[PDB]
């Protein structure tokens, strides 16, 4: 069945903030969140991602500066 | 054969208050990073090497574990020769240090730069003893100072914090004048040889 | 003096930092800020978190990694490129050893003052749960500056 | 008991191997005085818990051993102590001869050693040459030669970042000399306060030392009036630290001369070099009215009513009532207090000026009006809460 | 072949240093430059 996604009020005003400046110019970002198929859905935390040349593809996301956000994000409960 | 992480830490006191020994001396530590680093990380696998600070200008992490020594060589600048020094403080930060790094569950081990008999407290180094011996935490002790420096709280440290066999101290006396600070500790227990379990 | 503009957002996400790891009073949380600091009014456009330790019973004892902050930079390189480290905050009403001696390990990656915020967890009392203020010496001084609160067209909306 | 030709000469052979580079003429000196007693620039380790007056044979001698002096003990001894220690040698012979060692030789120092923050600490290699700057016009000729070089020390104070404070106050040492023999301690009280006043880290001195530093501050609030009142210096540890006799009382005789109002009482323990100022006894009556003045805020009137008549500071500040009128002109016009007074009823209201920071039954009024702030709540509170 | 080996391995270090620094910016510089390119013409420099 299709999920119903419950987005916080945190995580809301990120995503509108993050993809605000400029008509033409793309950015993207990543969400975190824990939930369970059907029902439970919800979300987190959510922070940009770098962009590569690409602009929105599968290539532009970034391990290497993911896994640092990791250890970051533990501390206060922002890891997911 | 041995996997640990080593995390070097910068002590001063009074009795650093000599800069040369034979033509330098504090110098000398820094061109050491770079045999400690290369026969521990490019020997094997699973080595990483820290270093901290918790006497002199200020008991803070001047650099965590990372991939290359230049970010430890980056650390020992800007580092006071002579100034206070606190011995409790330099095991915490190293706990907080070890406790957050990549290849859990393995063995532990400090290496410790001593020039002086570090005269604080007996009860507070017992309390210490065996919090690090829960956590497999390896205390290398090194002296310089003056000549040799011992048969005081620095060596009850060693024998108090020992409940197992080779995952605690191991000590090295430094010969003052032209001697090769990175031989001694190569030659040593420290890199390599015996601590691994 | 100088002026601190905060985003809503900041205050928002710094709140919300406490109750998911249910944070007792012996640990403390710290975190930085990003905006422009060349101005004399401070805007404060991102926050972020960092891995802080520190002991309760002991001031002297407290761990700040600077090369998290390193990979976290290079990523907003690829992101927003006006976005530089204006200074950081921390948890909890109380100043201690181990909050006032972490403030010079941010100067090294800002080039003005590094704003100081100290945020209440608990949100006890009036308004402004972070207050604002600034590193200044004659002993470190820290004075009161101006707090409002200001956001862009799209996040007042 | 011999802390140089002992003590230092048998330490010296300990630290460093053996010897820090010694020049046959170290174990000369140290058996030309003998028992004589002259230490004369004890050279680092002794030099640090040993202080020495007589005047030095060995000043150009240690210079070519500053490069021993850090890997031997500390690089402190040079700025702390030896060439910078050369004020308290006291020897006229001196005077313009140190440009060679006190400025020249530090500059040689300053392409090799520290060349920018130094090592170790923080602060060498600013207050070595910067102390000496303002030092050079502070003899000989007159001082206002030395104030056009005051301002280059104040410019590098605030480019330069120093962790101890003893180099800013330092600098405000040399400002303060410049008012020393110049009237209009006001500026000279002012520049005093910098250099010691509230700080306990900083500014770090002996015993007969507080006792000269508390003579410029007797001296300094004579002549006005600024920045409180002789009772300022009673909290802070000043006052307290010296001695009551030898002409250091001043400070205690014009603090409880302003409620007895008898001139003649501090008068007979000065000299007549500063009695036959009447600046003296003109800025002394205004303290005795500036304690009735911070009266005028809350004190008797509960009621909150500001009222001071002529009367009540009259017999306070030992005047006659038709000076009264021309004392108030010459306040405002000088600068120290605003306001207006009555002329028909006779009467003074105030304007904003300097509390202090005294306490007991000041905080008690200051309290009470607070709860009649909290009495209101009870009462205007209540009554729009319910409406 | 003893004092100039040691201040050698510095230089040699610090110049990978600005290699991976440069080697991240040369992806970025490459990528970032639209490959499309559009005719334009500026009216006043």
Same mark, same amino acid.
């Not at chain 4, 520290?114 to 030092?135: P, T, V």
């Not at chain 4, 008898?262 to 100022?277: A, N, P, R, T, Y």
């Given at each position: ?22 008509? =033409? ?18 979300? $987190?935390?959510?922070?940009?991602? =770098?962009?590569?040349?690409?602009? $929105?593809?599968?290539?532009? $996301? ?19 | ?33 770079? /045999? ?7 020997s ?68 410790? /730069? ?20 829960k ?10 100072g ?7 709280l620095?060596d ?9 066999q ?11 004048g ?20 | 003096?100088?002026?601190? @503009?905060?985003? !809503? ?10 109750? #998911? ?6 640990? #403390?949380?710290v ?9 004399? @009014?401070? #805007?404060? @456009? ?9 002991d ?5 004892? +407290? ?5 998290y ?18 200074? +950081?905050?921390?948890?909890? !009403?109380?100043? #201690? ?32 749960? @972070? ?14 500056? !101006? ?11 | ?36 007693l ?32 850090? %890997? ?20 006229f ?19 090799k ?26 003899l000989?000729?007159?001082? *206002? ?6 301002? %280059?020390l ?6 330069? &970042? ?45 015993l ?51 409620? *007895?109002? &008898? ?38 009137? *509960? ?8 009367? %009540? ?9 038709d000076?009264v ?9 000088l600068?120290?207090?605003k ?5 028909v ?25 607070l ?5 209101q ?11 | ?21 440069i ?12 490959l ?7 009216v006043?420099?």
């Amino acid at each position: 069945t299709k999920e119903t996604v419950y987005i916080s009020s945190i995580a809301l005003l990120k995503m509108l903030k993050h993809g605000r400046a400029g008509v =033409p110019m793309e950015v993207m970002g990543l969400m975190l969140g824990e939930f369970v198929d059907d029902y439970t859905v919800n979300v $987190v935390d959510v922070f940009a991602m =770098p962009q590569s040349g690409t602009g $929105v593809s599968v290539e532009a $996301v970034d391990d290497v500066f993911q896994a640092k956000m990791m250890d970051m994000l533990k501390q206060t409960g922002r890891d997911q | 054969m041995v996997l640990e992480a080593t995390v070097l830490v910068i002590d001063n006191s009074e009795y650093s208050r000599n800069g040369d020994f034979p033509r330098t001396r504090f110098e000398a530590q820094i061109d050491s990073v770079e /045999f400690i680093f290369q026969a521990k990380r490019n020997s094997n696998p699973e080595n990483t090497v820290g270093l901290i600070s918790g006497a002199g200008a200020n008991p803070r992490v001047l650099s965590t574990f990372t991939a290359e020594f230049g970010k430890i060589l980056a650390g020992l600048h800007d580092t006071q020769i002579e100034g206070k020094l606190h011995m409790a403080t330099a095991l915490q930060i190293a706990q907080l240090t070890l406790k957050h790094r990549q290849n859990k569950v393995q063995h532990q081990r400090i290496v410790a /730069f001593v020039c002086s008999p570090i005269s604080d407290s007996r009860d507070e180094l017992i309390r210490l003893a065996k919090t690090l011996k829960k956590n497999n935490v390896a205390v290398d002790i090194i002296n310089f100072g003056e000549i040799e420096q011992n048969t005081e709280l620095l060596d009850e440290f060693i024998a108090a914090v020992n409940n197992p066999q080779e995952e605690t101290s191991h000590l090295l006396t430094v010969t003052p004048g032209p001697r090769l600070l990175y031989e001694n500790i190569a030659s040593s227990p420290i890199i390599l040889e015996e601590g691994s379990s | 003096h100088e002026k601190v @503009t905060i985003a !809503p957002l900041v205050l928002l996400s710094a709140l919300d930092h406490y109750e #998911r790891t249910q944070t007792k009073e012996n640990k #403390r949380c710290v975190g930085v800020i990003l905006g422009d600091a060349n101005s004399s @009014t401070i #805007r404060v @456009t991102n926050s972020f978190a960092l891995p802080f330790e520190e002991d309760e019973k002991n001031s002297d004892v +407290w761990f700040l990694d600077h090369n998290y902050i390193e990979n976290m930079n290079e990523m907003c390189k690829k992101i927003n490129a006006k976005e530089k480290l204006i200074g +950081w905050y921390h948890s909890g !009403p109380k100043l #201690r050893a181990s909050d006032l001696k972490i403030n010079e390990l941010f100067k090294k990656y800002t080039q003005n003052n590094p704003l100081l915020l100290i945020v209440d967890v608990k949100q006890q009392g009036v308004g402004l749960p @972070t207050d604002a203020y600034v590193a200044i010496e004659q002993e470190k001084t820290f004075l009161h500056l !101006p707090c409002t609160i200001e956001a862009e067209e799209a996040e007042e909306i | 008991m011999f802390n140089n030709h002992e003590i230092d000469t048998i330490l010296s052979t300990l630290r460093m191997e053996a010897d820090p580079s010694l020049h046959p003429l170290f174990e000369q000196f140290e058996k030309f005085y003998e028992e004589k007693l002259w230490f004369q620039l004890s050279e680092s380790l002794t030099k640090f818990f040993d202080d020495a007056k007589s005047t030095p044979l060995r000043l150009r001698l240690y210079d070519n051993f500053v490069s021993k002096f850090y %890997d031997k003990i500390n690089q402190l001894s040079v700025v702390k102590y030896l060439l910078a220690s050369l004020k308290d040698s006291k020897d006229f012979d001196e005077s313009l001869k140190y440009l060679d060692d006190l400025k020249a030789q530090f500059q040689e120092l300053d392409s090799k050693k520290q060349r920018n923050n130094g090592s170790k600490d923080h602060g060498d290699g600013i207050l070595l040459i910067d102390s000496e700057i303002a030092r050079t016009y502070l003899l000989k000729n007159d001082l *206002v030669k030395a104030r056009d070089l005051l301002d %280059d020390l104040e410019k590098t104070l605030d480019k330069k &970042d120093s962790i101890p404070l003893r180099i800013t106050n330092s600098f405000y040492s040399t400002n303060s000399q410049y008012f020393k023999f110049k009237n209009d301690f006001n500026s000279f009280y002012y520049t005093s306060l910098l250099y010691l006043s509230t700080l306990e880290p900083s500014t770090s001195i002996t015993l007969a030392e507080r006792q000269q530093l508390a003579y410029d501050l007797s001296i300094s609030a004579l002549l006005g009036d600024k920045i409180y009142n002789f009772g300022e210096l009673l909290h802070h540890p000043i006052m307290e630290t010296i001695v009551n006799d030898s002409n250091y009382d001043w400070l205690f005789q014009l603090l409880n001369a302003l409620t *007895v109002g &008898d001139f003649d009482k501090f008068d007979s323990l000065i000299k007549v070099q500063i009695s036959k100022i009447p600046i003296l006894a003109q800025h002394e009556s205004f303290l005795r009215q500036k304690i009735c003045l911070m009266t005028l805020i809350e004190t008797v009137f *509960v009621k909150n009513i500001r009222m001071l008549s002529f009367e %009540d500071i009259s017999k306070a500040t030992h005047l006659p009532k038709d000076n009264v009128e021309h004392l108030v002109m010459r306040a405002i016009s000088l600068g120290l207090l605003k306001g207006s007074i009555d002329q028909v009823n006779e009467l003074v209201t105030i304007s904003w000026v300097q509390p202090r920071i005294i306490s007991g039954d000041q905080i008690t009024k200051m309290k009470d009006r607070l709860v009649e702030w909290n009495d209101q709540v009870e009462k205007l509170g209540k009554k729009m809460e319910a409406r | 072949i003893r004092i100039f080996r040691s201040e050698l391995q510095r230089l040699s270090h610090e110049n990978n240093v600005m290699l991976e620094k440069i080697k991240d910016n040369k992806e970025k510089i490459k990528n970032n430059r639209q490959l499309p390119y559009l005719v334009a013409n500026v009216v006043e420099v």
